[PDB]
């Protein structure tokens, strides 16, 4: 049973907190470059069309928000009441999947649909967050190239690493306007006039405030739409020279195209590039991290690396928490030795622990569930309950030995029948008591299940095993040490 317990313990996957249906979820829309507002709006409208038409029975309201910037989009999808969405075919787990599957079609639009990672910004699961550092004066080009090298080499190891991608944006075309200073002075125009006209016409300008219906608001000056949509329109503008002649922009400004990033990222002062990615379906986040740290070492000199966010988690479980378990076990052994006044006798209690863990593991494994916080607190609860159940038996027996003088071979079984009924009572009552948890349907059900199953299985197995094992646990310990 101990062996099978260990096997079931290492075979069982790990998780933190289950994704609970919150009645609402989100939909991300990313467009290429530069991608005008109209395209984004068209995509958002396709999305809304899906959620309103192909899913009337569940979706209630789609608060789509175009903005910041033109090529981005985001939709807050609300769903109908839980009681009006029965089955797995109506919960977020299927809605988001079906939706994103349907959004696979959309051309030139990275559109995804996802559920809220449990709570606030506690999305400290789902892969990692590798950050690439410009530890020298390399610039932006070589940083882009290095990040490209990493993103290229990381797609050649799909056996312990996956979904290796940047999170920011890629370089987009830009419009460079070379203001020839000499010609500007020669023609007799002020450079301040030039820059001011340019920035006010094409970028708008905060002039001063004004008063609208009792409330102070702003006054922006900016060219009309028609004269700032195309490159040639640069020529349509004239600045006033020193003499009194109006001078076109083409007269001194030489325009051309170029390339620049639209989302420069910096980490701890230095220029940086964020790289997202998941771990392989079989491997751990840790080994993915190690692989990444080995790949980033193959990078050109000057490019460093650092872990942030859900990679600065940090450390370590399960790789340290077993020390909490261990010291707790030690302390328990101590207090047990205190109650029994023996260094051996408490072992009869200590050996009752795996009789419950084997039930939690079996329950969690035979339900597709996973070892999470709920499973672990249910585990500790289980071992504590079983500990109680055993402790009372052994204490009863030792009372029968040190008060009357009855030998173990009689005192044990005499005490067990003196303890059988309450054990069965507590057991059955608590097993039926957690039944609503394991039975819970919808609305926080993942949690009530994760708490329910492991607890119930663990309790059943503990109470059907210890009831035959503890009386043997004692006599073995008692004989061997006297």
């Amino acid at each position: 049973i101990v062996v099978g317990m260990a096997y079931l313990f290492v075979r069982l996957p790990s998780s933190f907190l289950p994704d609970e249906d919150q009645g609402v979820f989100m939909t991300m829309v990313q467009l290429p470059a530069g991608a005008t507002q109209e395209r984004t709006q068209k995509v958002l409208n396709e999305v809304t069309h899906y959620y309103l038409t192909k899913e009337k029975n569940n979706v209630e309201s789609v608060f789509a928000v175009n903005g910041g910037g033109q090529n981005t989009g985001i939709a807050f999808v609300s769903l109908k009441d839980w009681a009006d969405r029965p089955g797995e075919e109506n919960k977020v787990e299927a809605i988001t999947m079906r939706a994103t599957r349907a959004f696979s079609q959309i051309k030139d639009a990275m559109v995804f649909a996802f559920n809220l990672p449990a709570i606030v910004e506690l999305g400290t699961a789902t892969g990692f967050d590798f950050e690439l550092i410009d530890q020298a004066g390399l610039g932006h080009e070589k940083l882009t190239q290095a990040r490209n090298q990493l993103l290229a080499e990381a797609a050649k190891h799909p056996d312990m690493l996956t979904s290796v991608r940047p999170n920011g944006l890629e370089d987009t075309p830009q419009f460079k306007i070379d203001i020839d200073q000499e010609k500007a002075q020669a023609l007799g125009v002020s450079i301040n006039d030039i820059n001011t006209t340019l920035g006010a016409a094409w970028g708008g300008s905060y002039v001063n405030d004004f008063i609208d219906r009792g409330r102070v608001k702003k006054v922006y000056v900016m060219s009309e739409a028609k004269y700032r949509m195309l490159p040639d329109d640069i020529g349509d503008w004239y600045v006033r020279a020193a003499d009194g002649q109006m001078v076109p922009f083409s007269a001194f400004s030489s325009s051309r195209w170029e390339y620049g990033s639209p989302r420069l990222e910096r980490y701890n002062g230095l220029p940086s590039m964020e790289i997202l990615g998941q771990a392989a379906p079989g491997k751990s986040t840790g080994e993915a991290m190690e692989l990444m740290e080995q790949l980033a070492s193959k990078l050109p000199t000057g490019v460093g690396y650092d872990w942030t966010g859900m990679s600065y988690q940090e450390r370590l479980s399960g790789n340290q928490a077993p020390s909490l378990y261990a010291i707790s076990l030690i302390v328990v052994f101590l207090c047990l030795a205190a109650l029994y006044e023996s260094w051996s006798i408490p072992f009869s209690v200590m050996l009752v622990v795996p009789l419950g863990v084997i039930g939690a593991l079996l329950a969690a494994t035979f339900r597709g569930l996973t070892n999470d916080v709920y499973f672990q607190v249910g585990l500790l609860t289980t071992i504590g309950l079983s500990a109680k159940n055993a402790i009372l038996i052994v204490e009863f027996a030792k009372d029968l030995m040190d008060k009357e003088g009855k030998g173990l071979i009689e005192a044990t079984l005499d005490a067990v029948r003196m303890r059988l009924r309450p054990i069965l009572m507590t057991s059955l009552a608590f097993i039926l008591g957690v039944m609503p948890l394991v039975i819970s349907t919808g609305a926080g059900s993942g949690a009530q299940n994760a708490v329910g199953t492991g607890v119930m299985g663990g309790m059943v197995t503990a109470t059907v095993l210890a009831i035959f094992f503890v009386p043997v646990f004692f006599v073995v310990v008692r004989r061997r040490f006297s």
């Binding site: 609970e20 919150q22 009645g23 609402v24 309201s61 789609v62 807050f76 609300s78 839980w82 400290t124 988690q313 940090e314 479980s317 928490a321 909490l324 010291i327 707790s328 302390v331 328990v332 101590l334 207090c335 047990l336 205190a338 109650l339 916080v373 709920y374 607190v377 249910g378 500790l380 609860t381 071992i383 504590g384 309950l385 500990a387 109680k388 159940n389 402790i391 009372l392 204490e395 009863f396 009372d399 009924r421 309450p422 009572m425 507590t426 009552a429 608590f430 039926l432 008591g433 957690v434 039944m435 609503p436 948890l437 819970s440 609305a443 926080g444 949690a447 009530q448 708490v451 607890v455």
Partner: protein
């Protein structure tokens, strides 16, 4: 929830003075979720109480003897909330689940207390008042040591794990509180109730 509750307050002072056609909608509300979460936990709490009562009446076939562990449930549970206020804990999901788990390690103490006295009465025929003395005086150290060791399994989980460990603390304190309370009740309320109610 204080914030999202104050929102409707600061918002209902605008609703009357709204222009012709303005309607407020709530397309994103992660507030009734926690509501029909905690509520759906309280539900299982009550149901657990009921089923415990049913198993109790299924074994100890006395309608007043089954009240003893039933009464001893909200006593230990309510008192935990008091201690949770005295340490700075909140009535979140984790806490409530901690209560629902604490149920068993409450009713275990309770059932031991009651049933041992019952048995002593069924084997010695001592008047309940004396039988319960002779029984509590037989299971006292057992219950206390049990409190010590169970608190010993739960407490060290409060440390530390940082972000992830905060939850473990939420569970640890909530549970150990209910433990010590269950045992204090096991020496104060339960023996007294098993002395004045048992037939």
């Amino acid at each position: 929830l204080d914030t999202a509750a104050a929102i409707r307050a600061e918002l209902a002072k605008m609703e009357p003075f709204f222009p012709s056609g303005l309607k407020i909608v709530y397309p994103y509300d992660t507030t009734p979720f926690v509501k029909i979460s905690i509520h759906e936990v309280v539900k299982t709490l009550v149901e657990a109480i009921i089923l415990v009562f049913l198993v109790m009446y299924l074994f100890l076939q006395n309608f007043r003897a089954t009240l003893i562990p039933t009464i001893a449930v909200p006593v230990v549970l309510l008192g935990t909330f008091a201690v949770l206020a005295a340490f700075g804990f909140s009535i979140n999901t984790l806490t409530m689940f901690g209560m629902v788990l604490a149920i068993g390690l409450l009713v275990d103490d309770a059932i031991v207390v009651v049933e041992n006295v019952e048995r002593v009465m069924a084997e010695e025929g001592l008047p309940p008042k004396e039988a319960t003395r002779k029984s509590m005086g037989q299971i006292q150290g057992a219950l206390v040591g049990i409190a010590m060791v169970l608190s010993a399994v739960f407490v060290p989980m409060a440390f530390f794990g940082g972000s992830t460990g905060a939850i473990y603390r939420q569970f640890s304190i909530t549970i150990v509180s209910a433990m010590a309370l269950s045992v204090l009740v096991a020496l104060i309320l339960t023996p007294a109730l098993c002395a004045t109610m048992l037939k």
